[PDB]
Amino acid sequence: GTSQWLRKTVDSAAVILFSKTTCPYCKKVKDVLAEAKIKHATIELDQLSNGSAIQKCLASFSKIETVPQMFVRGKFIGDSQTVLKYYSNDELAGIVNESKYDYDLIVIGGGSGGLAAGKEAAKYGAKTAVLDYVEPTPIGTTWGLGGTCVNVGCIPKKLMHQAGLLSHALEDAEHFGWSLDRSKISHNWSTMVEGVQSHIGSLNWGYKVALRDNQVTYLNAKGRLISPHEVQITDKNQKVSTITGNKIILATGERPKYPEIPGAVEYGITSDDLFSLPYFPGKTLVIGASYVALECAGFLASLGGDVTVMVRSILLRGFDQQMAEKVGDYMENHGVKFAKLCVPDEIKQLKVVDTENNKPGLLLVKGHYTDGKKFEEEFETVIFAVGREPQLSKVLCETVGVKLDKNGRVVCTDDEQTTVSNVYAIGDINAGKPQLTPVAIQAGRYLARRLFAGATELTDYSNVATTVFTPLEYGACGLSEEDAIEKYGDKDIEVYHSNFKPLEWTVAHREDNVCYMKLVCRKSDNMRVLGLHVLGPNAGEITQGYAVAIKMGATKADFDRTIGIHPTCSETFTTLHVTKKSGVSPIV
């Protein structure tokens, strides 16, 4: 147990020191490695409950049982007198750089997970390379280092969401006494895009600076794993070459899908293109009903667009469906049109995009409803948000032996190991995991610590909270109500709910009974909170803190005994009492 942990740790750490905080011999080795700028992991045996056993086990490798003991890539290098000898003789640098491979770690993909993993590994002396390449979209859009969230995901989406929220702020200000007239103010799309892109550019630069200052090699090159330890790279000039690494982390993410209909690739766009578009989209059709589809339709309408969403079946498939319908009803009440039970059959081009005058084109969209009636209408911009998929055939030779599932994602053990023992996968391509930036960051940091610093902590993928940044935001943590009932049965499930009105909405004359929250609980387990849901402003700030409590096993009793902060929206969770079974109305 201890011995099996010690062997895995010694075998895969690049540079690691076994030590005690009280030992001045260990301190003298620490000072020598620091002076020579040699980074390494450290395990302080006196701060572990079974340091005694570990000290004994080290002898199976070094034939000594004292501290310090220093190792490089699975090899015992020496005790204090031996390390000092190598240093004094100008031999230590060459010893710590000796390796069978070019790199201790190669990360394929420079996004949320891959950047996190690579920087963390380098902290412990692992010689690291991070590869990143951005295949341009069909119209040629491309961007810098940092992945989907930084460049064409969470960051620009929430900034445009905030531009949309500020329109209601301008309306609210009149009621709170400010002299402006909202009716005489307009929005300039390209001014907003310039500011968003300027912040994204600071992020691109900041990541390149951070890899430099951690001695990580950054290659702006497309990678392909051709054997367990060999990565083929293709640079911007089409020069092909091969590098080797001990450990491989696959972190290449996904890209948007297009439906297989005439005109889609040629004349529509995706979210990849939207966040840097030089012109305002104009009258827009959004095809799809994911959170990407609704968030984009939402802020486009708040910025003055004429917007329609075409929905194949339901909104937010996989989310609690009562909450999804409340989300959609609010958008429909504040300007978004919906073409329900409808799919597209073709896109026809009526005008080409005007690069000169900076204006969209014009399109004719033909489709049909599930009963066979026809859809036909003209739009200036058509955005497809119909899912995302990995392209691992471009990343992964079939002969390496890395197993994939029926969706093309990588099958991994609970420590992110693929079917090939030195190869791991993290982020959106890890099958069955929540596809979110903080998950990918936590998985990559934790994995790097296990590979190169002897850590054991695993990433916990259960009960991970989410927020959908629609015009009225939807936060959630845990099970939907229909999932809870399916798993435990209706008689074992109690639901507490209530409407509420933000105090900020009162003087602004906004709606009385639109915001909503519920707790889904299990009767036979001390009224354990199985799921939490809230529709209202700042839903991400509201929901985050409760995710710690649900992680700890919170029950309805724990919510009741905690006192609220007044006046907040979030405090309504501490006094819930109306049950759905009672039939009593949840209005205020």
Ligand X SMILES: Cc1cc2nc3c(=O)[nH]c(=O)nc-3n(C[C@H](O)[C@H](O)[C@H](O)COP(=O)(O)OP(=O)(O)OC[C@H]3O[C@@H](n4cnc5c(N)ncnc54)[C@H](O)[C@@H]3O)c2cc1C
In the annotated binding site for FAD, the residues are 112-114, 132-133, 148-149, 154, 157-158, 222-223, 252, 255, 291, 391, 428, 435, 437, 566
Cross-strand bridge partners of residue 340: 311
Cross-strand bridge partners of residue 476: 466, 533
Run of H or E residues at 70? strand 69-72
The pairing of beta strand 69-72 with beta strand 15-19: antiparallel
If the CB atoms of residues 122 and 331 are measured against ligand VWY, the closer one turns out to be 122
Give the separation between CA 206 and CA 228, rounded to whole angstroms: 32
If the CB atoms of residues 344 and 427 are measured against ligand X, the closer one turns out to be 427
- Contact window for a second copy (CB under 8 A) among 254-262, 270-278, 342-350, 560-568: 560-568
Interaction partner, residue 262 (a second copy, ligand VWY, ligand X, none; CB < 5-8 Å by kind): none
Check binding of 270 to ligand X (CB under 6 A): no
Check binding of 484 to ligand VWY (CB under 6 A): no
Q: Look-up: residue for tokens 């750490």?
A: 13
Which residues, including other chains, have CB under 8 Å from residue 198's CB and lie 6 or more apart?
A: none
Minimum Å gap between C-beta 274 and ligand X is 8
Check binding of 273 to ligand X (CB under 6 A): no
Give the separation between CA 97 and CA 473, rounded to whole angstroms: 52
Which residues, including other chains, have CB under 8 Å from residue 582's CB and lie 6 or more apart?
A: none
Give the separation between CA 493 and CA 485, rounded to whole angstroms: 6
Interaction partner, residue 552 (ligand VWY, a second copy, ligand X, none; CB < 5-8 Å by kind): a second copy
**Nearest alpha-carbon partner for 380 in 360, 365, 366:** 360
Binding site: residue ranges? Answer: 20, 55, 67, 80-81, 112-114, 132-133, 148-149, 154, 157-158, 222-223, 225, 252, 255, 288-295, 312-313, 317, 387, 391, 397, 428, 435, 437, 483, 509, 560, 562, 566, 574
Q: Based on the residue annotation, tell me whether 566 is a catalytic residue of this protein.
A: yes
Check binding of 118 to ligand X (CB under 6 A): no
> Under rule CB under 6 A, which residues in 126-145 are in contact with ligand X?
131-134
> Under rule CB under 6 A, which residues in 238-257 are in contact with ligand VWY?
255
Task: Choose which of 318, 401, 432, 564 interacts with a second copy (CB under 8 A).
Answer: 564
Strand spans (E) along 4-68: 15-19, 41-44
Minimum Å gap between C-beta 467 and a second copy is 5
**Nearest alpha-carbon partner for 218 in 350, 341, 108:** 108
Give the separation between CA 538 and CA 384, rounded to whole angstroms: 27
> Under rule CB under 6 A, which residues in 130-149 are in contact with ligand VWY?
135, 137-138
Binding site for Mg(2+): residue ranges? Answer: 483, 509
Residue type at position 121: A
Give the separation between CA 112 and CA 436, rounded to whole angstroms: 9
> Under rule CB under 8 A, which residues in 142-171 are in contact with a second copy?
149, 154-155, 158-159, 162-163, 166-167, 169-170
Task: Choose which of 449, 497, 533, 556 interacts with ligand VWY (CB under 6 A).
Answer: 449
Count of chain residues binding ligand X (CB under 6 A): 34
Helix ranges (DSSP H) in 489-580: 504-507, 539-551, 556-561
Strand spans (E) along 193-341: 217-219, 222-227, 230-234, 240-250, 255-256, 284-287, 307-311, 337-340
- Sign of CA pseudo-dihedral 518, 521, 523, 526: negative
> Under rule CB under 8 A, which residues in 369-408 are in contact with a second copy?
none
Give the separation between CA 213 and CA 209, rounded to whole angstroms: 6
Check binding of 115 to a second copy (CB under 8 A): no
Residue nearest to ligand VWY as judged by C-beta position: 255
Minimum Å gap between C-beta 179 and ligand X is 27
Interaction partner, residue 111 (a second copy, ligand VWY, ligand X, none; CB < 5-8 Å by kind): ligand X
Check binding of 239 to ligand X (CB under 6 A): no
Task: Choose which of 61, 258, 375, 461 interacts with ligand VWY (CB under 6 A).
Answer: 258
If you write DSSP's letter for every residue of 386-408 in order, what string do you get?
S-EE--GGGTB-GGG---B-TTS
**Nearest alpha-carbon partner for 246 in 228, 258, 271:** 228
Check binding of 388 to ligand VWY (CB under 6 A): no
Interaction partner, residue 147 (ligand X, a second copy, ligand VWY, none; CB < 5-8 Å by kind): ligand X
Residue type at position 351: K
**Interacting residues toward ligand X by CB under 6 A:** 108-114, 131-134, 147-149, 153-154, 157, 222-223, 251-253, 271, 292, 394-395, 427-428, 435-438, 440, 566
Active site residue ranges? 566
